[PDB]
Structures are given as C-alpha cells and as structure tokens.
Structure 1
Amino acid sequence: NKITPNLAEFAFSLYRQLAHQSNSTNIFFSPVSIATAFAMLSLGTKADTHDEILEGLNFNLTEIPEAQIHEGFQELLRTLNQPDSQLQLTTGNGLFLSEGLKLVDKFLEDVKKLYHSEAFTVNFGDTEEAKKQINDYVEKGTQGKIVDLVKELDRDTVFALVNYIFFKGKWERPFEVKDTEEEDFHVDQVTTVKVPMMKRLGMFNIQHSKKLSSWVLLMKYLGNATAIFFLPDEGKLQHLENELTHDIITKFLENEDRRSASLHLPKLSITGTYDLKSVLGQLGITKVFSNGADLSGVTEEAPLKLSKAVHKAVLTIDEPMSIPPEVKFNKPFVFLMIEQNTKSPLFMGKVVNPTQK
C-alpha cells in the first residue's frame, strides 16, 4: 500500500517518543488505528489545523496529494474489514459531539462511508453520563473486552474521539501443544516475574542480527498478521531501538529461511491506553486540540475543538545432530505486528514487565 512507508515512519516516531519518556514502561499501540482515526478527523479540518494532522502522521504534503492519502487509508480499511481479518481483529472510531451543534452532513457521510466510523450526538452538560455513554459504545463494540476506557472527562468537553483496536492472537501454523510451564521473566537485574512459557523445538524463521545485536523471530498469526520479535543481546535494548528502520524490517519480512531452534515463548496478553492529546502534541499535532482549531468541516457556525482523544489497544492470546540454539524470550523485547497484504504496522511496542498494570 502507497501509505505503508508513512505509517512505518509514524510507528517509529510514536514508539521513540514513548520510549524516550520512560525506559521502564511497557509500550503497546496501533500505528495503523491511530493514523486512520486522525486521517478521518482531518476531513472535517482546514488550513494549518488540517496540515498539522497529516504532517504529524509523517505525510509530506509537498510530495503526496491528499487524495492518495485517503485512498490509501480506504484501501487499508477494505483489507482489515475482510471476513478472515474480522474473525481476529476488531477496530473502531467513535466521535462524540455535543448536542445542539449543527453538523455538516458531508463530514458525517465521509466518516461512515470512507472510514466506517460512527458519529454520535451526546449531552456533555452531564459529564458523568457522557463518559458512561462513550464507555458503553466501546464495551458494546468490543463485546465486553474494553471497559471504563475514559476515566475522566473535562467539564468543558464539546468533542471527544475514541479509537480502539482489539486483536485475538492465535498462531496460524498448527503446533504440537505442550503445557504452558511457568517460567522466570527477567524484567531487570533485581526484578523477576512468572509467565506461562510455551516450549517448542522446530524449524523457525529466526536469525541473529549483527546490525541490531538481537535475535529476530518472525511468527505468523490468524488474520493475515505476522509478528516480528526482537530480543536484544545483554545491554543492547537502546541500540536495537535506535537502529530499527523500515528497510531493515522489510528485509526480515521477505526472508523465508528457517532453522532448527528450541524456543521459550511467553503466552502474553497485552494492553496499552494513551491520551492522544499529550502524545500527538509532542509529534506536532496541537491546533485541532486548541481554541484556534479549524473544524469548519465538522460544524460551520460554532467554535469547536477536539477536547479529548483516547487510544486503547488490546492483544489477547486465544488458543541436525548439533544441539540447536536455545532462545528464551524471558527478558524485555521489542515487537511489530504487520498486516501481510498491505505490509502496514498493525501494532508496535515493547514488553518490559508482563505483569504491569
């Protein structure tokens, strides 16, 4: 897909901002779902408000026409909404707009038809009930999986955007199931937590990378998704995060060479929740959240700004005579989950503490 390189750069920009903030925290977000939400929001924006959003998603507006960006997002959504993808992946965007605002019909039509998102009218005069209605939409949309997503709403809220993505992870290849034996996971030098570990001896798409100083393992999942796990060598996590590029990842995805290996793979479910106003502001997306926002494509008469923007991402695990290498994913590791048809980054992150709340 034409916009995959831009989404890859957005994934790295967002990942590196979060990793810079704290080196002890888990990171788990969807570059694809966040960018889709903000490209959608951009249809109701104009001038510097609009340009800041697309440049914030790593689209250089002097090189790529806007029509190709929206076509790229619509094609991506078509791929993600295919039956087999829908079996494992649920994605959605909820726009909550203050009642009594005269909404632009073209924006509502473009949101539903092009981005498959829902726009709702809500009473923000009752901030506790509005927060309940938003959370009920997310809970209904995720069949109970995501609850109390919006913990607090500002008193002056007139417009909220909620972006969610849920992935049911299951290995595509049938494997000889073993007991998930509890094993040590070295969070750091003095911290160890127990995790269910699946032990396997087989032919795996695994290699040790000199450039990245890491073991690199590629695994296939139901829903046309491939995960790439980077297990850094001792003291090389920062080097790994610094050296990652889109071209390096493409080379890994094109490789089909396999080798015998004894792997210890933790059966981990992961979640990430972000305040996009804070995170995206550091990437230069600020005007749409300010009093000066040009949201005249959403409402023509009244002033409007995006008061609240939240992202929630959830992954749950469903379910040679020479001694081969033994690789245990029993310490912090970085990951990317790619959609196979588009090569888009569905998820990106790092597991530091598997039992982190």
Structure 2
Amino acid sequence: AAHQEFARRLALFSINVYGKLSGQKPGENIVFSPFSIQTCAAMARLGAENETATQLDQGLGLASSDPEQIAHSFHQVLAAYQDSQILRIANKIFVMDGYQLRQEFDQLLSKQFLSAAQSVDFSKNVQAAATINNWVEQRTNHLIKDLVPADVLNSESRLVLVNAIHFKGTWQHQFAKHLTRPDTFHLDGERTVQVPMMSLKERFRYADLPALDAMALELPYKDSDLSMLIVLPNTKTGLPALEEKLRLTTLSQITQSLYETKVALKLPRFKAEFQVELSEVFQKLGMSRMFSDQAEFGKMLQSPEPLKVSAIIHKAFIEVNEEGTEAAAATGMAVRRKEPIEFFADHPFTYVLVHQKDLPLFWGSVVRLEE
C-alpha cells in the first residue's frame, strides 16, 4: 500500500545517498537520517517548477509530480509518527522579513508537512542562524548543534527549510552492563582497538545472507515496531564489498529473510556523529539544477525574485548502549535570491534503524572506534 511504496522508495534513496557519502567521506563512521533528508527536500520541491521539480521528483524517488499528492503522502507518514512515545519529528520554515509565501506552498507546508513558520532577518545572519539552530537543538534534545552556519546566510537569503528527527528507545532485550567488557574490534588486518563490548544471549530474528557473504540481526525496541538491523560481513575486511552487494538487493528483501533463533550477540557500545554538506551528493544523484542560476523555485514566494538553493546541510548523532539507543538528525536547506548462533560485531558493519522492518529512519556504519 502507501506505506510500503513510500518505504521502498525511501530505502532506495537511502542506499543511493549512503553510497555517495561513503565515497565522499571514506574511513569515518557514517550516520544519517535518509527520512530527514527526503522530507526536507520534498518540502522544497513543493515550491519548484519545470526541470528543477522533475529532477527532485526523480532523484528523491517521489511517487507523484503533483505537489498536493506529494504532500499528502508525506502527511500520511508524519501523522503516524505523531502518536509515538519514541519518535519526534518536526518541520519548520524560516522566512526573510517582508517576504510572503505563496498561498499553496504555505498551506501544503502547514497542513500536510505540519510545518511551523517564523520570520527572521537573514541580513542579521548571526542572529538568524542562532534562531534556527536553537530551534533544532530544542527538537533534538540538544544533540544537533550549529546545524546552519551563519556564514551560509546573508541579506540575499530568503528562506530556510528544516526537518528535525529525534529517537529514544529502550531495547526489548537490554544488555547487562556487568557483562560488558573491553574486547577487540578489528579495524582491518593490521589494526585493532579495545572497546567496550556488550554481550547478550537471547532469541532474535536473524538471517544468513550467503549471497551477500554476510549475516543480519534485528534488535527490537521495547513497546514498538521499531528495530535496529545490523548487517555484518562474514570477513573482517568485508564491509566495502558488502556496501556494493547491498545495491543488488533491497532492505525489504533482507528483512523478509529474518527468522527467530537463539543468538550469542556481541555488540560495541558506541556513539557516532556525522555532518555533511549535501550539494555534491544531490548533484551526483542528478539533482543539479536546483543549485544553478537556472533553478526554478517560482512557487515559493509571492515575490518575483528568482531563487536557488545555496546550501543543504545534514547532521546526525547516535548513541548505542546497554539500555537502548538515542539518535537525532536534522536537515537544513537554504534558499537565496540569484547451540546459539554467534553474531559478533567485532569488525566493521552497517546498521539501519527501521520502522515496520522496511522504512529506514537512520542508516550508518561503524568502521572505526576509539580507545
């Protein structure tokens, strides 16, 4: 249905972005919220026209070229997440003093994307960035700071679109802290580090993935249909090969493979933070016109001023420990006038924080750990 299609399109967008990020920022732990990125960009699409809009439709994987339909489909997902004890999602638009949104854009953002709105003076760009970034902090339990630098805002800025997402869940099956001990995490064939390694024997949904030379495990969050999917290469140095093989399948095909079994799990206690300016990723996914002097965003403002995207920034944070997971992310877009089975995660792996086994909220990799 609608959820499954939305999820499928988002999963493909996710692996698309992940591949470009891995290439742009090699050797570091990736974490991002594809949901946050797709939602923020879809909000911008509502104000786009012509080839600019078509590129966004195709690069984001939207199911319609009709702004009303696109908005309705995001509303279905957002409205579901309003009634949650674990998840909080928030949208807001920040608009230059004296500029008015077009009626349709305004109504779709407010009613379908549940977006708030505030007028700001971008010519006072230090002040405007503080307003934006303080709001993001409030929406992410202070985990995402300084999202939009003052230096990307100026008197030519006209609006900033922001999506924020915050997650705090408890494991259905928590780890016992007294079992956590320093243990070896293999960075590669020449390098290892000692890290706090959590240990738990329990029944989990599991899949052997021989076609991907990997194995997967699902860790559910308590009182929810949310979970963490871990995909673990069979070889210590296998993650780059696995990241390529993932493109040959889908998240839903992976999770459909899972079955409950007794597992001896080892998993590092870890935190990761990641930040990226996404313009190059978008260009590489075929969404270049939005940054150019040919950008078409004539449906955003009543003003006849031509507009383009000057920056897209994403930041994310995740903390995994014995009790559960806390994660957060935000995306800002600035627009301007022109017997047990062993599952030992002791070498690099990829993970996905998923809703209903098929909709990715967060996606990351652990390739290195300190201390």
User: Which residue is equivalent to 2:125?
Assistant: 127
Give the equivalent residue in structure 1 for 2:225.
Answer: 224
C-alpha contact (below 8 Å) 1:29/1:349 kept by paired residues: yes
**In the alignment, residue 369 of structure 2 is paired with which amino acid?**
P
Q: CA deviation at 1:196?
A: 2.3
Counterpart residue identity of residue 171, structure 1: W
Given the alignment, which residue of 120, 141, 151 partners 1:143?
Answer: 141
CA shift, 1:135, in A, is 0.9
1:288-308 CA distance string (max 9 Å, x none): 233332222211322222322
Aligned partners of 1:158 and 1:307 also within 8 Å:
no
SS state of the match for residue 189, structure 1? coil
Answer whether contact 1:166 1:314 (CA < 8 A) is retained: no
SS of the equivalent of 1:211 reads helix
- Rounded Cα–Cα distance in structure 1 between residues aligned with 2:183 and 2:19: 30
Q: Which amino acid aligns with 2:96?
A: S
Gaps of 5+ in 2: 324-338
Contact 1:168 1:316 in 2 (8 A): no
User: Is the alpha carbon distance of 1:176 and 1:237 closer, same or farther for their aligned partners in structure 2, counting shifts above 3 Å?
Assistant: closer
Instruction: Give the whole-Å Cα distance in 2 for the aligned partners of 1:68 and 1:245.
Output: 28
Q: 1:245 to 1:351 in 2, by over 3 A?
A: same
Please show how residues 1-357 of structure 1 align to structure 2 within 5 Å: 1=3, 2-59=5-62, 68-83=69-84, 87-154=85-152, 155=154, 156-173=156-173, 178-222=178-222, 223-234=224-235, 235-245=237-247, 248-255=250-257, 257-300=259-302, 301-317=304-320, 319=323, 322=339, 324-340=340-356, 343-355=358-370
Contact 1:164 1:312 in 2 (8 A): no
TM-fit CA distance, 1:271: 2.7
Deviations 1:170-213 (A, max 9, x none): 21245666443232322233443443221112222223321111
Amino acid at match of 2:29: N
User: Aligned pair in 2 of structure 1 residues 354, 157: CA closer, same or farther (>3 Å)?
Assistant: farther
* Aligned-partner Cα distance in 2 for 1:108–1:57: 21
Q: Distance in 2 between matches of 1:120 and 1:293?
A: 24
Asked if 2 retains the 8 angstrom alpha-carbon contact of 1:270 and 1:315, the reply is: yes
Structure 1 gaps of 5+ residues are: none
Q: In the aligned structure 2, how far is the partner of 1:27 from the partner of 1:192?
A: 19
Partner SS, residue 153 of structure 1: helix
Q: Compared with structure 1, are the counterparts of its residues 193 and 134 closer, same or farther at alpha carbon in structure 2 (3 Å cutoff)?
A: farther
SS in 2 for 1:244: helix
| SS of residue in 1 equivalent to 2:112 | helix
Provide the C-alpha distance between the structure 2 equivalents of 1:240 and 1:93, rounded to a whole number of angstroms: 34
Please report how far the alpha carbon of residue 248 of structure 1 lies from its aligned counterpart in structure 2 after TM superposition.
4.7
CA contact (8 A) 2:175 2:198 kept: no
Alignment correspondent of 2:333: none
TM-score, normalised with respect to structure 2: 0.84
TM-score by length of 1: 0.87
More strand by share: 2
Shift of 1:280: 1.5
CA shift, 1:355, in A, is 4.1
Identity of aligned residues (%): 30
Q: Determine helix, strand or coil for the equivalent of 1:94.
A: strand
- C-alpha contact (below 8 Å) 2:290/2:308 kept by paired residues: yes
SS at structure 2 position matched to 1:269: strand
Matched-pair contact (CA < 8 Å) for 1:159–1:305: no
Identify the residue that residue 327 of structure 2 maps to in structure 1. Answer: none
Contact 2:232–2:349 (CA<8 Å) still a contact in 1?
Answer: yes
Q: State the alpha-carbon separation in 1 of the partners of residues 282 and 78 from structure 2.
A: 22
User: For residues 240 and 24 of structure 2, what CA distance do their matches in structure 1 show?
Assistant: 13
In 1, Cα distance between equivalents of 2:344 and 2:130: 43
Please identify runs of 4+ aligned residues in structure 1 that moved more than 4 A.
64-68, 174-177, 245-248
User: Residues 299 and 124 (structure 1 numbering): CA distance in 2 closer, same or farther, change over 3 Å?
Assistant: same
Give the AA of the match of 1:13.
N
Aligned residues: 347
CA distance in 2, matches of 1:180, 1:103: 54
Q: Kindly state the Cα deviation for residue 130 of structure 1 after the two structures are TM-superposed.
A: 1.7
* 267 and 134 in structure 1: CA distance in 2 versus 1, 3 angstrom threshold: same
Give CA deviations for 1:194-234 in whole Å, capped at 9, x if unaligned.
43221112222223321111121111124421221111122
Is the CA contact (8 Å cut-off) linking 1:161 and 1:310 kept in structure 2?
Answer: no
